């Protein structure tokens, strides 16, 4: 047998499912962000688990410990690189105050919306998966792509599959070869 | 002194002390004597299938007020006779005796949902076919 592949389980089911105020305050962000499940929210709320646990574990050891000066100084330099934690507020203090909408916004789920070329968070949600969307070359086919702060500036169309130019598609040639041109065939 | 030794040589007492007080806990003595293996006709299982013996005679350990269409069953992994139960009750028409079930508890290892002695096991799947797609009027709901 070969060497065992490892695999994690990234969502954290809640303590009380029938807690009505939570369910009301959890549906508030589904249709706001155009999501699919509470598992969508459980993704973020399981990231917050390990991040907010490592942050509280590192503070318990007093600095002049270079472990805190190494593993902390890259975590603090990683969430910045995504675009969720802000540069002015990085001492791993504000990271415990950071919340779900912050991570859930730094996503091309959203960021097709709030830097132009949007027309909905539904009109563009179908265009992540119809791939009328791009980065530098390679279409980021998943709305939870977590845009790493920089290719935001590099939002582009796909050169194939139009509305960025260069094609007609799979329904024009039943129709603009019968009606829009071939009224007289 | 709070009734206990404390001094830092007395652990000799303490892990022999709690050793004799775990037996006053209930599931400890239930567990470490194999009582689930010497008894409990599942034998530590989670399900069992067995033939239906017959229609069941109601002996009141309260309260569900009818002849509850229940089934005397005797298993085949062991052969130990247990009274059983069907939910979605009624429909006493659609299997003979000496016919198969699949048993599973009520939620406390049963012990009480109706006026029937020892009725603690819901039937899940008669003869391999289910009940939930058989109370769904695809197939039909058995007899004893």
């Amino acid at each position: 047998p070969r060497a065992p592949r490892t695999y994690s389980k990234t969502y954290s089911t809640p303590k009380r499912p029938y807690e009505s105020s939570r369910l009301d305050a959890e549906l508030k962000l589904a249709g706001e962000f155009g999501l699919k499940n509470k598992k969508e929210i459980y993704r973020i709320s399981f990231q917050l688990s390990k991040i907010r646990r490592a942050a509280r574990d590192l503070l318990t050891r007093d600095e002049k410990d270079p472990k805190r000066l190494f593993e902390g100084n890259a975590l603090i330099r990683r969430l910045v690189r995504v675009g969720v934690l802000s540069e002015d507020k990085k001492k791993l203090d504000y990271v415990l105050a950071l919340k779900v909408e912050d991570f859930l916004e730094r996503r091309l789920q959203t960021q097709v919306y709030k830097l132009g070329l949007a027309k909905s968070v539904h009109h563009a949600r179908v265009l992540i998966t119809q791939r009328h969307i791009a980065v530098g070359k390679q279409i980021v086919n998943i709305p939870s792509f977590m845009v790493r702060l920089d290719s935001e500036k590099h939002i582009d169309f796909a050169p194939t599959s139009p509305f960025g130019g260069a094609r007609p598609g799979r329904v024009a040639r039943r129709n603009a070869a019968r009606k829009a041109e071939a009224s007289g065939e | 002194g709070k009734g206990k030794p404390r001094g830092l040589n007395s652990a000799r007492k303490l892990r022999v002390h709690r050793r004799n007080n775990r037996w006053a806990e209930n599931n400890y003595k239930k567990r470490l004597l194999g009582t689930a293996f010497k008894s409990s006709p599942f034998g530590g299982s989670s399900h069992a299938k067995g033939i239906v013996l017959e229609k069941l005679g109601i002996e009141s350990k309260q309260p569900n007020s009818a002849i509850r269409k229940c089934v005397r069953v005797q298993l085949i992994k062991n052969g130990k006779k247990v009274t059983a139960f069907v939910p979605n009750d009624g429909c006493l028409n659609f299997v003979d005796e000496n016919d198969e079930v699949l048993l599973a508890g009520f939620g406390r290892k049963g012990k009480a949902k109706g006026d029937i002695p020892g009725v603690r096991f819901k039937v899940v799947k008669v003869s391999g076919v289910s009940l939930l797609a058989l109370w769904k009027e695809k197939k039909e709901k058995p007899r004893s």
């Binding site: 009301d24 549906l27 589904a30 249709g31 706001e32 999501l35 949600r125 | -």
Partner: protein
């Protein structure tokens, strides 16, 4: 039912009878649009009965 007559397909006739059960509104718009309609249900205006209430929308 009729396997090779009606239901050997995964679905084209799930029941695609234009004879409708509910009067041309069977479209619960599934998944993301379903929770979108539920987000329109709960976040525009509405409140129904007096904070605490019985169990599925109706008159008091």
């Amino acid at each position: 039912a009729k396997v090779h007559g009606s239901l050997a397909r995964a679905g084209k006739v799930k029941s695609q009878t234009p004879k409708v059960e509910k009067t041309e509104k069977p479209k619960k718009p599934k998944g993301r649009a379903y929770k979108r309609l539920l987000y329109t249900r709960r976040f525009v205006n509405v409140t129904l009965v007096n904070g605490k209430r019985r169990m599925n929308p109706g008159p008091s």
